[model samples]
Target: AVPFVEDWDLVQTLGEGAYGEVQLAVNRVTEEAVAVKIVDMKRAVDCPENIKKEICINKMLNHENVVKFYGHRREGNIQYLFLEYCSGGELFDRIEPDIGMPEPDAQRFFHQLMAGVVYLHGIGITHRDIKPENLLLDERDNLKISDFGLATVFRYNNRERLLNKMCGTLPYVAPELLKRREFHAEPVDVWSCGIVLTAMLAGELPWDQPSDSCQEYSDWKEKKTYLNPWKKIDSAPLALLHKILVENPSARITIPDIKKDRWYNKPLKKGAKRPRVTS
Candidate 1:
């Protein structure tokens, strides 16, 4: 870990994992709060490939919906990645245990998230990991894609290599991914977003979706395709969900494709206020 100056006061623990804890600290000179994520790289994982990717990917992104990585430092067996402090906390925190997000609020969040994913795909990066926990929100409640641990640069030659590793939360995994068949990373990411949108509205998954199962669970996977509740949702958010979760990977929705969808361009209810957001 980078040596902490004596003047920096420890505030509170932001989060913790098997590897280390993220501490909220106050910078004495600047009088600003910062999140200092401490990681014991050696004990954290067998290799630093994931850590290296996290640093490289975070530094490369410059989108409104992507988190800000101030800097990172590694010393001895530990590492520290200082990121912008998000007072609004994880998006899941606002959405979990109940489906309380108003239609307008969720629209802002999902649209911005799509913008971020589109930006990443435009630059040839695939965020293999897309889940509620990986989404952070600032004080204004604007969403940002945070973790890049499982992200990979999509390339023609390495497509087969990625098929071997079934990375990502199972409930969010595309049907093709679970089948061990070759799949495009960008479409798979969109599939996960659909699940997220559905779960955020309905409070819990419609199906008993487990993250893993040794036996082939083809039936359950296929059932999720028809779970869209578009007619019931006032904003018709599930319409977007349905388009993204197409069973045929080749026909799946994409970031740019979603942008041009007619439904997304519909005017918000008269006098509905748009949420404030910044890149």
Candidate 2:
């Protein structure tokens, strides 16, 4: 029901739902592209408490790997959140479902994801949802972590903190989260990144849930070694995956360790070079 902004012109919708829809728009003079998330405070199901959290967390974060929060405003019952639009579309689009993306492509995206995660954790925030759908790509192919609805500030003061929220997408959620106990914020993200990486390599999730009830999870827990995706991974990244998807959150891999890994530190082998021929 909301339309007509003073300084911007609406284009097409990027996403829509109960509260409101995200519409593509352009500046009146500058003509710069933007995704305007219009939320109707009146129709919002969970209330603005959660929406405001995303606003706060989004405002605090600024990185190439994370989506840029331009600004926000309010008009009556409507909440307008301006954001940088990623034209290249969702990283989920690049995934081949059952076959996965190429190693080099997946590695590039994975590296970018880790960089963003490092920054988020360094600043005491954790993005509960870290799936491919949440990972977007701009025109230049840079991976941007989108959506902060489930993100929360885990470190507020000089001391670290624990969280008890069981919020996240199922396939990418960490095993420890199934217990719904107080959990360390960073580890869950790490575990999710593990699943994301695995999905990218295998083109599908290894399990529906991380709980023992799922046979796929138990097979992985037992280190069956014959799993499709696990076996599909190369030695280098597979080693990193093993450290990341640990059942014990305390034993899960840290950003420092990942940063120092041989494969992670390895130089990307860009595409083959072609000789230039000028007339």
Candidate 3:
């Protein structure tokens, strides 16, 4: 079990959010480094419930591509979560401005992300947030999915489920949530993946507004065939991107559909050297 604040030495501040602050701490007994997420509950009663849910959901996940949750502790009004320390930092930190990740490198990273999401969905969980901010890289550049504060169960009785909360970051959110106020948990995640994948390959967002009503979306539909980023990539990969980025929720490709794509199934060597971008 991870010790309380008294038994851990503060290393540095990792980050902060509405819930609370996450810090780097070293255990006195084991002398091992770990991330401690501190959630202040004295500020509000409902804060405890959110923290508890995040803890429960994280504990249930066990996968190579997912962040490891060691344990947690509650002291008076403060709750602490002990997580595996990721040294490579957030994936967002690696994307160079105007030079996005190379397609091959981005494909490998996306493959890992898809594997993680597939595992989550297989276990009946939906990681409502899937943007680069929540994705961390290890020392070896291996991607790991993190942050489950907005995650929820979307499967029951072997049937599809619906959610209504306006969750997830704006740009990455699915059109159904904003347009129709419909939230089919799993499909919404797929939509977010499309946005994330596009950003990874193109080094920028395809459009600010992903809905049909947006002028950018309309312009892209009419001209994506000759767009700078789209034209730069080969047809096979472009085809896959189109399938995933479909504005229509029902029309968007599912995780299984992506896995079966020729571009997605292409084999990548273990420890492949990452591609460097040049503007």
Pick the lDDT winner. 2
> Candidate 2: worst 10 consecutive residues by lDDT?
1-10
RMSD of 1: 5.5
- lDDT string for model 2 (5-71, tens) is 3478888998786547889999777778999999888775575776777788888988989989998
86, model 1: CA deviation in Å? 0.9
In candidate 1 the C-alpha lDDT for residue 192 amounts to 81
Give candidate 1's whole-model lDDT: 0.71
Alpha-carbon runs more than 4 Å astray in model 2: 1-6, 271-279
What are the per-residue Cα lDDT tens digits for candidate 3 across 31-112? 7788999999877768878888999899889998999998999889899898888889998887766567777788888899
Model 2 vs truth, CA RMSD: 3.4
**Cα lDDT, all candidates:** 0.71, 0.86, 0.83
* Top candidate (TM-score): 2
lDDT of 1 at 85: 81
- Comparing 2 and 3 by TM-score, which wins? 2
Model 1 stretches with alpha carbons more than 4 Å out: 1-7, 44-47, 96-98, 155-163, 208-235, 269-279
Badly placed stretches (over 4 Å) of model 3 are 1-6, 268-279
